[model samples]
Target: YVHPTDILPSGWPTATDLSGGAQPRRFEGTIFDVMTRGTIPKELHGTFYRIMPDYAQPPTYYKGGELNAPIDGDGTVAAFRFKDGKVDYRQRFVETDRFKVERRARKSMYGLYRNPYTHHPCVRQTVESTANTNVVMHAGRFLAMKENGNAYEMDPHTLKTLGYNPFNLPSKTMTAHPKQCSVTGNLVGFGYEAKGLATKDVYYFEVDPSGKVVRDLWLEAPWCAFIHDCALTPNYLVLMLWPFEANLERMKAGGHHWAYDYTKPITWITIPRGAKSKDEVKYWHWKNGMPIHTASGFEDEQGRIIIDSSLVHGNAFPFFPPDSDEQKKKQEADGTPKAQFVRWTIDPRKDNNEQLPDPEVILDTPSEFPQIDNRFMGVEYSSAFINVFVPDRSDGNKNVFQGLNGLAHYKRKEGTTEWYYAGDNCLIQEPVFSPRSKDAPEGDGFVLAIVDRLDLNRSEVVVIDTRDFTKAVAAVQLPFAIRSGIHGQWIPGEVTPDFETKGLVDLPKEEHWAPLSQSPYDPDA
Candidate 1:
């Protein structure tokens, strides 16, 4: 019998797309004895869980008549468990609603990034979250998140997908980048386009360490935009809205969901931490620029909120071009814009809050995936660990797409940056900070990151002491290479579940397609 998924659709798996970092890794298993070099610090005890997008089957949609954005692939969770100076590795699929449906059919059922009109009829009504962007730990639960849909809860120890929207969030989706408050231990996050596609509504909520909702507030952006990440401080929430606006009319024509709308100014909607409703939200707009990821934010003594982020003068994402063909050609001529770590100071008391004050350029270099000491998050801090691009290095410049080849510790106060280049053909992922101890002072910890050996086709998780960037303290090498990951965190060993005794459970397999009554697939309807 011919199956719907047996033969992939046209425009699938373009040769040029999956040759490098975009290559899909669809395996799931465990390794009890991962190879090691040097000695892993005894103080570094915990698990590093990350989410990577690897398609289980060929994707359906094509972008600009080519393959879809690689970021839209299915979510795969990777865990590196560290205990007693040794590590074990395990990875599993999140099995989201889309994942399960597509798995049963054995093909890609969805179409286009964040567009339901192009999806298979059966999944048009279902929640089509990929949950492939980021992973965070809160209240002993590991959350696999995607910005356009609700999070999926997974077992912390086994990395097993447990349930969807386990906390019953009041909104349709949750932000992949949720900030954990250092003072209160609360998970702060927001959902954009809360009601549906292209809506300006946003919902802000706080979850305590026990996975219970503490505060729920409804707010709206100045325009319909992509609020991929936000900055959190003790007193304020900075929702920086870039001009990646969505247009339903374009999606109906099977075009991209979002394009860089140059006409719309970049707005920063700052709301007081305790605000009860959208009425209390304040707005400030920057003339133009695109801000990608935020490092950290805090309120200084002068009554101003300081946010550190990577910003570029033009479109950082080449995949989503501007609406106008003339503008697109000009952008193409301008070439890729390198990001600089900059600081934006927003003062709510300013009389001319309508226009955001100019931002101060911190480091005029290519930087992204900034990581700070977790304990100093949303508080006054000086040090930031980042993934940096060193132009002179061959490995760094070889692959333009995977340009980061080194890890750096940037001291904001001292205005100094110390770096550790990964050496030839080794691309580094985002750095994660692990405290030396529960009560250790700020920056007194170890920085860990995964290094992908492009030529060797394997990966290594390297650990470096915060005090010294000259060399790595230890490294745990993987037997097989893993797909590129977005963001992740390092949870302390104490918070990890009792997997020693409980062990890995045999989750019952789900192999049947959903009934038509639940997910109708009528081609002629």
Candidate 2:
């Protein structure tokens, strides 16, 4: 019997993708009254929405000893609602054009990651976005976003996939890491390779509180690099041009979507937030730093743009091998790269010809997926939290991918750190910060993260109070494990009163999806 989560049986190894943590979890519906360990804080009322690439059908991209990148799987969004000291859970797959088309066929239709030449001919003309990276709440709507294609809109109340390009922004693609401007209440983001795959064009845009694109500016990156994430200060937007290069010919030949060249000098592009022309954009240069995730951005009193981030010194992903064979072998010998929490200070007024000085290493401990109090995003903030990998406490989890085994809260002002270890048999996912109250002091809140229990094959939501990270305040245990995931956000209950009204649906009467046209935004299309 074929399991609903599994593809049809085939003995050939390439017939199915059984990669660790990529196991199908095509589950939906609600789980009210989730069991809890410790007490749930009464004030901790909000919804935590996270998205992951959970494959519906077994992938067929296992040839050449290369498996489909986890980010390429179908995006399944999960919501955990916390209210009045109780928690309710709901999980559903985002019905993107790619997802709906595959659903009709009842089989895997796509080929490799961002490679259309290897895809089945039937899907060559359709949108190829997985919408599997991050799900964020912006302008009263939940947007499931991926960098390779357009962002898909979903109902915040029901978690229903609405459609793509709901706002009809001028940009064809949007970044998954759009930062909310705390000062102006605007959503600031940019799309690299905006014109098409391997294009240097970038669309830097801003949306007002009402979700209307007020600022649509076109710029170009230093190279056709993967600008996965960026930093935003109140006055400037700092973009890190990753060393990963995408070549149309390489992808057409069934090669990796991004080829990494560690030797390439990294360039930092800083643009004035309200600039009217490309002349206002300035570039600074650096060497050999991969920003996996950025934590915060602000400007110092000296008018310097400061960015706090998780910087990996070498190739962080093993799937995309280094550009050089010698470097690949050297990487294998060194093991996976460790991402360090660091800070970059860029003086926008400095000469563009000079390379910037090295960023100051804030925390030497390996860490990633950093989070900060949202209110202090574009300002000088004292506290930052992140997922840390402590080798001593995380020895037994062999199935670990990201390898985070604990959560740490760092005080930037005092240079002190507090930690909560998950244990030897578990792995920790990204952590999100929930302020204690609307007017509370920064870091005066709880940090929530998904802790995967390898021993039990399930997951639990662990809540650690920032004031005291020695122990968790509560653990809401789920009945099933969530697939290995990326990023998530916390939406306070006060802003989500409509969720309790039950059937107060305000969306269009009919569910409408734009015809799957091959837009220039789709990197794989």
Candidate 3:
């Protein structure tokens, strides 16, 4: 599946993408039966699929947009394959409609991350979705996804993009962090800002394991903040709406979708897991902080819904200017936007009609991009992992990205933490848990992730045994760098999981998804 690209694309040389190890690279071909430093048990055989952004060309249409970050690059897929304990690497660009046009043009043809109005004149009418955030296996199919919420189908073994298959999803957009339930064999997901405007509408739905829509629920939020992550319990769904400010006026009038109002409070919304109406939902508020990723959530026997999140003390992502000294001091006092693991408990029964207590900071240090076993998505069980923080960073370490360094495992019951620190010169991305056996105890699996060794100028897959889970037990060393990705998953190389259509109502199709007006912003039509 590797495309021969000895000659790199016309990439951004010194602008936003050069910071840290955010630079992009392309590769194909395979490393056959590469040897690892430690033993790789044959039982842990599968493929690890990750989604990343590669700045293949300069942004000709990004004018008048917040180009401070290099997140607007085209999406790329990286796959780590394991068979009989042997490792191989395969990668391909997600062959989306936008990518096809850019390949023919040999240049970037689109612009503005979310606002379709800011596109180049020649590309203003083009609808492009960079499937860069996450990947998952559903209904015997693999999908590439983005926060905008639509998913494109891709060949699992080949990493080749097929076409846009919303799985008949009716929402215009979907969350990048859709949860796959271990108990029900369903996709527990939602779409934020479902309406193009600043409307409070968000759609929540369940895709049965059989690939049919079983439940569809519509809900509203108090603030139109960004809902990047969602958590699930067997009985409820948890959404953390950070005050990142979703201004419909900006997106419609000025093409702005990246600004945040940090002074606002963080809101937590919960809905009954199998509700027939919006009346089964409730919401609570936290005074401060932001949540970009959720670890896991479940309800305890005492009726308390416990949710874990990778919380940032301040703006998790940089959405404002560094011009204000007061803001600088405030951020300094608040510390950089490092992600800390946190836990919040909610009671369904009324409690004096007051706000709940502050969230409990579970970890002493910052970690991010948490992952858990697929079979344990909404259950109150042990075992969760996060990419550890790198000690050294770029740009004088002021308002820069929190570089990935290592991996850590948290044991909720014993309250113990185990970590695998790659090294000062190496960086680790998101870690995905691959259980040794489907029925093995929860968290009894192997931790899989990608690490970029700066000194070696290449990237590799690091495998850790969660049974004793501490350090890298095996490594699939590659000869080139794979730019860090937002999310990934471990897909078994065997029969697909079964999905029963017991309660499914109808097979919904995403008919003409025209959520905006006929201005230049209406490329989606």
Candidate 4:
């Protein structure tokens, strides 16, 4: 049941049924679970299983050369009931089968032969949730860029394609490349990197549910690329930018793309929604040498937007001029890079009445290599808490036994930060904070996070006391390792009132917990 992100030679054989190559070689299917901490095991853990759908391939060897495999376009819903660590019953909502015969033919031709890796056509899968309908809001990749036409929307339960909205920009305009996005109600905000013009500019697009453009605005900054994830608030779209330029040409050139220069300054800019044009977009810029990977934004009780940016190394470019031989040699040596946490206070009533002064350095640390490099993954903020997790470590500590769980939490009003060392190398998916409710604990709330335990080949869902960030209250270990690079959501309250009248099932009890797991695992795990 383990679905490790990277393919492990030892694990692959167990996932496949036979040695010889055949269509859909692995028939045992993959295993995924949602566990509840129990007293018998010192922690109640609930394990639910999912058989790999006929239309889907096993986790291993699925991504490498099988990108374009045709999927059964069936809109079926599968449900299972588990109690006291055992399955009670299973149910499914079966739909009429639909096949992408055209894709199947392409696979038989270009995919089966010639460039097997390049010609694989991908079929989207259904992502089901207890919350009836799932909505995804994301930015469009720069047109003609890598995987330009690969963006899509699908029914989570039925695995049916809803639509594909391509970036309708002029060819080679070099505007911002869309990286990540967020959705609120019918409003969708996505961040992109606009590099066609001499300098790099970050653009924010607001669109409706039907894919109609609402707001198209740009932030004026020199060589700023919005490459990481962004956060959306009711009043503002927080776009974080690093000064590094992605060499699209060098990437296409293939060989030696990794050898390019990496030294550069990074900055974060926040734009208010009321601005009229690009010029009116108020911004707060950071000139410090910290490279920001990701950021999240949440408004405080007083309504001031609080943003936390994860800072790694400044850049690979030499701080001193490359003209010096000593500087070049120093860059080659292994050492810990300086890292810091940058915090900004955004107020709409400020002068320009938009952005405030330079961000304040809330926390500073020196030469923490892996921690610094790991900061690039993702970050999240909530009303009472701010959480950031490190996935990869670049520090020279080469011990494979060294676990990588590094988490930092900041509680509003307390002004103090707490760090948790999980003693297990964990690749963290984004953290979600449970909304404060009348029946919930007072003061701060709770945080639900997914931890990918690389060493164990499994993922765990952990609940943390937000008020006391270091405490691990409960956790459920999954039966399989989930692929990395996953996006998730937390739905609170009851099923939308439109469900039953709209022919939906009755809402499940409050204690029923469902965890939807999906990721791209490597065959070499």
Candidate 5:
């Protein structure tokens, strides 16, 4: 499950809407009871769903199915049963089919206090399975997991642990943290942090089904500082690296700290398939001034890998103190305040082994951070179009540009880029495109996005037309508040006939129910 939150409540005194309204006010009488009793979603309920398993269980307490990393939160995974909206107990086992937490040791000094107990931030892992039930998932640092930094894997449907394959190199180790992983067949790829004391490298590792590392390659660069998101195709791995890094202490300094430095180039590293080592990983690099928070890629009609990069400064808002004096000074220095979008095309066969040249700037947003600002905020891809949402303007006034969320589409073509703005505002996370409906019209194919409505203190699942980014085709409001964090996937509407016909475990008739009373917060409530 991709969890995206509007407010990063780390050190804020009051919660503000996207419009900057709703400051904290003093409350009389027991504020604790009032806050807890009226919390949004008010209560949590179990929603049953099913998916077919690719492997049989060993009857062990734990089993593994498809694992998915939560798009916005840390150390979380969402597993599902294969059938459409159906919960089958016979198919259920103590497998890693449900979201499992991976714990890791922390590296930064800040983590010492912020995450002292675990000494690690929880990392989330998620899988996108093919029609055949083969799955690929991304795993990395977030709120609860930390030690096994910048590493992930592709495994069989069992709960066996795999070896480490660090995405960061010795050169990029200092600031390297693998944020997401993309899988196509046996090849698994991900983007790594490349800032501060970290060497900036776009890395990918190809592994076999036995959990053995086969090959690893680093994309040659214009130096990507922090790669937030990535998309994969049969032939290439597309990465979106945000430009700009924040010094947490400098943000605390409060006065004009560092100017907006857009000089650092945002890049798209297209690693060709069949590459065996770092020397074999051929790619192109582009230095667009826009800082990329998230990116998605697909082969356009002309067969060029069209990549859409959404622009948002990595250090925006609570991640970097908004009220700091240093931020104000930097804002003054960099006249432009809002974010923008950038597009690039890379042909792995071109450029005689050198990095690909600059990309085209197809679309630009004047002053708003078009995408949300949390860690996993950004756009995801479908076959023909890319979907992104901008914040909604407050008070129903279009001229004010309150940063309400709206979606945009970037179409692919050789040597050119075309875009259509889809209208609507919702706090969106990484969207799951319907691979099953690639040829459908703009609005027909489904795209799944998560919406966090802070006003209601809850989140919702929004389904949009992949063809027309502006339209909301369907929505399912979730019943709980999810922390802002990283990416997830959709188990298709149908279960594979093989799992059902082969007669694995007898499907259970009764719903596999887990009581909310078992939750720690349920008793207090």
Candidate 6:
């Protein structure tokens, strides 16, 4: 593992550790099986693939210049296999264009967190698609993805970097959070902020079971808002357009990223899956709100849509700061917003989306990184699993984990939420639910998550039985700590994907799609 050093070149940004006290670690494939902590469930058999941001090399830029946002990091992939009474581990860094160039230079030449223009000339026009946000396995291809560019395909067994766009994924950009349809054996994903740094356009597309784009279209958001996590329901696609707007003027002036502007409205957008045209899409507005991730959503027999999300009152993540004094004062005083599991219901019978009933807060705990049994996606589902932060009594902190210390299973049918605590000093991230079998009953599966024990100063994989959340089915202790990343998934042992990307997947090739320049990087800017 590569450890952080006090030694560095002069002018290296002070904010380089912007991840907020997160320890920087980069390691290789000398792994082991930790079956001693507990016992693996006999029914468990799958690969838990997770991606997180880590500094293989110090970032070349800060917020704008140096210091760097922690979000800017070389992508790391950690794969855990569960079967045959033992859990094994494997990890590797994605060999991106920048990773190759920087290896030659022996230092970080890339710049900007997510902005390409801020990068050094050698790689300015390049989308450094960090591939750090999420891991997806579909159509026999395992992908490491960033929301801004095409996903990087990887070797499922060894965690090897196969290549970029190996599956013929057409969109130049793919959101990290894509929906895997168990019924259709297809996947649907999208990319927003499609027009350079602050454009209001987002493109939605579907990849068939063979890894080809069958359905593709462009959609616009309420503004240049951050539409990070979206929902793919049976009848429609859900995109929550938060009011965080990208300041085109500030960006052109070469400043920081976007900011939260309450002046604009927050809305949830829905496009009928059978939308023959983009014009058929509809929208619903929720006054003054923001959501980080949607647990899962589905359509009922009556055609009513229910999307459960980690909803917040205001700016949950400070990607952008409040510009005005009134906004800044309110924000600074209130601090960060706590996320709760809230259900956003959009009735097809409603006269209009604007007058819908208030959303219901199902599990009202201070929580984030909510997940559900993805196999039941786009259908009425039971049991939502998530990371809950309970106060640490020893330190007297309001929250035990600066991240999360507990996992929960919210069974909608039983109307009860069960808990699994990973100790006071042990922090957890995004609880991923992987079923024992593709056809297993709902909640009858294993939940995988990376647990970082503060007291031990190390990391381990915790497997909890979905049917029983009081204790972990097993714990795969790690040699080092894995960064608390954004999102992850479980690829069944049967779904080992192949990488055959021989060429770049071209886009805007059709008349209906927006040309490349007009879609992602606006030339006028």
Which model scores highest in lDDT? 1
Model 6 stretches astray by more than 4 angstroms: 1-19, 32-35, 60-67, 167-170, 349-355, 391-401, 497-525
Best by TM-score: 1
Q: lDDT values of the candidates? A: 0.80, 0.78, 0.71, 0.37, 0.36, 0.71
The 10-residue segment of model 3 with minimum total lDDT is 497-506
Write one digit per residue (lDDT tens) for candidate 4, span 166-228.
534322222122322333333334434343422355555654445456666766554534344
User: What does the lDDT read for residue 106 in candidate 1?
Assistant: 77
Per-model TM-score versus the true fold: 0.90, 0.90, 0.85, 0.54, 0.51, 0.87
The Cα error of candidate 6 at residue 128, in Å, is 2.2
TM-score of the candidate numbered 1? 0.90
What would the per-residue lDDT of candidate 5 be over residues 406-431, giving only the tens digit for each residue?
44544432333223232333344445
**Count: clashes, candidate 2:** 0
1-525, model 3: which lDDT tens digit per residue? 657785657545432431245454755434545556577779866678877877555556465223535556667887776767766666788877777888788876665667666565776555467787788888787888876647888766556678785586777777777788878888888887776646578898889988898888989887777887888898888888877666656666644565555566778788787788898788887666777678888889898888887777786555442234666466556656655678887887865246778888887566677887767778877788877663343222333244556677888988988878877677678888878787888788788887778888887788888866666678887766777666788877763332222110223477756645635755555
What is candidate 2's lDDT per residue for 65-147, written digit by digit as tens?
Answer: 24666567788887878877888788888898888888888767787777777778888877788898887677777789999
- Model 4 TM-score (2 dp): 0.54
lDDT of 5: 0.36
C-alpha RMSD for every candidate: 10.3, 10.2, 12.3, 13.2, 13.9, 12.8
lDDT of 5 at 52: 18
- In model 2, the Cα lDDT at residue 11 comes to 34
- What candidate 3 gets wrong by more than 4 Å, as runs, is 1-19, 28-35, 64-68, 252-255, 319-339, 351-353, 390-401, 495-525
TM-score of 6: 0.87
